Amino acid sequence: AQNPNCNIMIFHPTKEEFNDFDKYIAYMESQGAHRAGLAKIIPPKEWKARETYDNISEILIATPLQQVASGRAGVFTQYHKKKKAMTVGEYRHLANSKKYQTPPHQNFEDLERKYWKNRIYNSPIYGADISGSLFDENTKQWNLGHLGTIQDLLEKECGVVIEGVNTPYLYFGMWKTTFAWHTEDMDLYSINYLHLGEPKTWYVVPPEHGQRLERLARELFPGSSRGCGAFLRHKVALISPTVLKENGIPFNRITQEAGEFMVTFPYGYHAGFNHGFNCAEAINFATPRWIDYGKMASQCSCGEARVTFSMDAFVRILQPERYDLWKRGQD
Ligand SMILES: Cc1ccc(C(N)=O)cn1
Numbered sequence: 001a002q003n004p005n006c007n008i009m010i011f012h013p014t015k016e017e018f019n020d021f022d023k024y025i026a027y028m029e030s031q032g033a034h035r036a037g038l039a040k041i042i043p044p045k046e047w048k049a050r051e052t053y054d055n056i057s058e059i060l061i062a063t064p065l066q067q068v069a070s071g072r073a074g075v076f077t078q079y080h081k082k083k084k085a086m087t088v089g090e091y092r093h094l095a096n097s098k099k100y101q102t103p104p105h106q107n108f109e110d111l112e113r114k115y116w117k118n119r120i121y122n123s124p125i126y127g128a129d130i131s132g133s134l135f136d137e138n139t140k141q142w143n144l145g146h147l148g149t150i151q152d153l154l155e156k157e158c159g160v161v162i163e164g165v166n167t168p169y170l171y172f173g174m175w176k177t178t179f180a181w182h183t184e185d186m187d188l189y190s191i192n193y194l195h196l197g198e199p200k201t202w203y204v205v206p207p208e209h210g211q212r213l214e215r216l217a218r219e220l221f222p223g224s225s226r227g228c229g230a231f232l233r234h235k236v237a238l239i240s241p242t243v244l245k246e247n248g249i250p251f252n253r254i255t256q257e258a259g260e261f262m263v264t265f266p267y268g269y270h271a272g273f274n275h276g277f278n279c280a281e282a283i284n285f286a287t288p289r290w291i292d293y294g295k296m297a298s299q300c301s302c303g304e305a306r307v308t309f310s311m312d313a314f315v316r317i318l319q320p321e322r323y324d325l326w327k328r329g330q331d
Pocket residue numbers: 214217218225229230231232233297298299
């Protein structure tokens with residue numbers, strides 16, 4: 001078996017290898033990449049996402065989210081307090097202000113130490129889940145707005161015909177902005193391109209060990225667990241690498257820099273944080289190997305987790321028994 005220790009693999013496709021997205025994902029998996037839950041892909045040197053990022057400042061963040069933490073440094077939840085709209089120009093200025101800017105640090109490891117030591121004592125503002133794309137329309141390779149849709153994958157594999165669409169989202173981050181432990185909706189893949197700015201550090205649990213993380217989460221957040229059998233779907237829980245190590249949870253970490261892609265694989269739990277002002281673009285996608293994961297995916301039915309329009313059809317077709325109770329939570 002390839003990659004039995006479930007290490008995060010890093011790929012360097014040539015421009016020739018970068019033409020066929022599906023084929024390269026399949027290649028990565030032939031090398032065992034999916035066992036880690038996360039892979040890095042460094043684009044060929046000839047490739048560019050867009051010519052320049054001039055005027056990005058005009059983009060509106062309609063609902064910036066202030067990420068307020070509760071708990072202890074290594075085990076906490078965050079809730080999102082909605083703030084007034086601001087442009088990316090205003091957001092960038094805020095990110096770079098004395099109150100919010102990245103502190104002096106020696107290297108990535110020093111900054112990681114500072115993050116887990118001090119995260120809960122601050123409330124950074126995240127510009128998350130903004131529908132849109134920053135890829136040039138003339139970028140033909142790995143353009144996250146030009147991928148085959150999940151609906152077409154389901155149609156090709158299963159012959160089913162469903163409503164729904166599948167578009168990218170933009171994420172504007174600053175120092176300490178955080179994504180909580182989660183898998184994707186319906187345990188889909190995700191792909192994430194860091195367009196510009198400071199790095200993003202990722203933590204990931206191998207899919208074959210995801211239930212170990214769930215078990216620990218139920219122990220660490222017992223009230224949340226009683227409220228919902230799938231509460232990690234709420235995307236509010238953080239657990240530090242130190243606490244994961246103390247509890248024997250297998251995981252890996254890696255830092256993504258501007259110009260790099262990350263792919264998360266079905267049922268690969270991940271969490272992380274931003275180093276400073278940056279902009280990422282991400283979208284969910286599917287492959288034939290995903291279908292079985294979609295069938296098995298656990299759902300939030302307490303009503304907390306956000307349900308996109310398109311997820312309805314996935315649950316309806318892949319999980320018809322769950323559908324009625326699940327939509328009872330959506331509506
Ligand atoms: C605590 C918890 C959260 C989410 C899930 C899941 N399978 O989605 C399971 N257990």
